């Protein structure tokens with residue numbers, strides 16, 4: 308069993324990286340991949356950099372070089388669901404691009420030609436993540452997570468998402484891209500992220516203040532999930 | 539340009555069947571591999587080793603495709619071919635556009651001070667390789683085609699007039715064309731330090747008629763971009 312884990316930023320992967328035993332590092336395509344064992348379980352941890360293309364590049368490299376059985380996307384997120392506070396957990400049941408528009412040719416809003424309109428997360432990974440949430444006593448919401456190449460900061464950017472995707476529970480910049488690569492390679496995928504801000508006009512300030520907390524809570528989740536999936 | 543292996547190997551990327559089909563047909567001793575939803579066709583085009591990839595549409599599809607092409611085929615350079623929406627007023631359907639630079643028109647991390655279109659960790663724009671631009675300009679002249687060289691912008695939207703077009707023109711007044719893949723491939727190429735250029739042809743002018751124009755003139759754009767790419771591959775490999 309080899310678990311793939313992808314995060315965008317140094318702050319989002321640094322805690323997991325430290326826990327890796329027999330840590331070997333691969334540097335390529337502007338990405339770093341840390342391989343070794345996390346509490347006995349073989350893992351490959353990718354630091355991808357930010358945005359859709361960075362994530363797609365990273366995911367493709369991870370899949371080709373390390374051949375993980377599943378991928379977990381971790382990190383921060385902007386919370387959309389009203390019951391989410393900073394530090395709470397979001398789990399994807401589905402991912403969609405909020406910034407894709409080929410509606411001129413009759414595709415669904417968010418849907419790219421040749422792709423499904425959304426990417427369903429793996430049911431077994433979701434069930435496992437829910438068990439982790441219960442074990443860790445955390446507040447969490449499971450639902451649609453939407454991705455774009457924008458940091459959402461209130462105003463019209465936020466309103467447009469809430470309008471087009473009223474059931475979206477969180478927004479970020481990589482998950483859907485990773486879900487797309489995984490789809491094309493038939494690899495099970497789940498997003499397990501923690502809230503750093505609520506994507507409003509103070510989101511940049513909240514992000515700066517609470518990125519560390521979001522990394523700590525998503526790390527707790529991911530460490531627990533790795534262990535549950537090994538068994 | 540110095541070949542990495544024995545001889546020069548040219549990577550070519552197109553999104554759509556219509557954009558790659560003419561080039562594919564010209565490849566000698568062609569072999570096909572399928573992976574990650576992408577098809578790669580390898581062989582010789584007029585004696586020059588090429589690897590042609592059909593990526594599918596949009597930023598992620600192109601990024602995944604470009605990564606696979608680099609990893610599996612190790613090309614010395616990449617040319618992105620296909621159609622585009624023309625923004626410069628002098629462009630007509632069939633005309634050529636060459637990138638001197640690419641930017642994302644839909645990337646916005648301005649809340650943290652980044653330039654509009656710039657993603658953190660990237661330059662605000664990706665400059666295309668000078669040698670590839672110069673060879674493309676030489677081909678344009680020899681074939682006596684009308685062409686514009688400039689900023690090409692990419693995003694995950696098909697531009698069709700109204701506010702979508704107005705926003706691009708406002709944010710990128712120097713942009714000469716718009717499409718959905720080129721900047722993604724440039725970004726991948728940047729990270730791997732591989733020379734890149736866009737050589738596309740105009741299918742529409744991204745206005746309220748662009749869906750109708752695109753459908754009628756996709757074939758013409760494929761034809762002219764193919765003509766350019768074929769000519770460029772020859773120029774790159776043989777002086």
Ligand SMILES: Nc1ncnc2c(CN3C[C@H](CSCCOCCO)[C@@H](O)C3)c[nH]c12
Pocket residue numbers: 315316356357358382383384385457458459460478479480481503504505506507510514647650658
């Ligand atoms: N409000 C928000 N909008 C979009 N994405 C996010 C996120 C998730 N990610 C965090 C990060 C925000 S952009 C980085 C800003 O820091 C620049 C220093 O590198 C991207 O990888 C997306 C948290 N809040 C968000």
Ligand SMILES: Nc1ncnc2c(CN3C[C@H](CSCCOCCO)[C@@H](O)C3)c[nH]c12
Pocket residue numbers: 409412420553554594595596621622623695696697698716717718719741742743744748752753
């Ligand atoms: N007006 C435009 N906006 C964005 N991109 C393009 C392009 C470039 N490509 C053409 C293609 C259009 S989206 C697929 C539409 O399929 C309709 C089937 O004929 C994308 O790969 C981008 C030409 N005109 C454009």
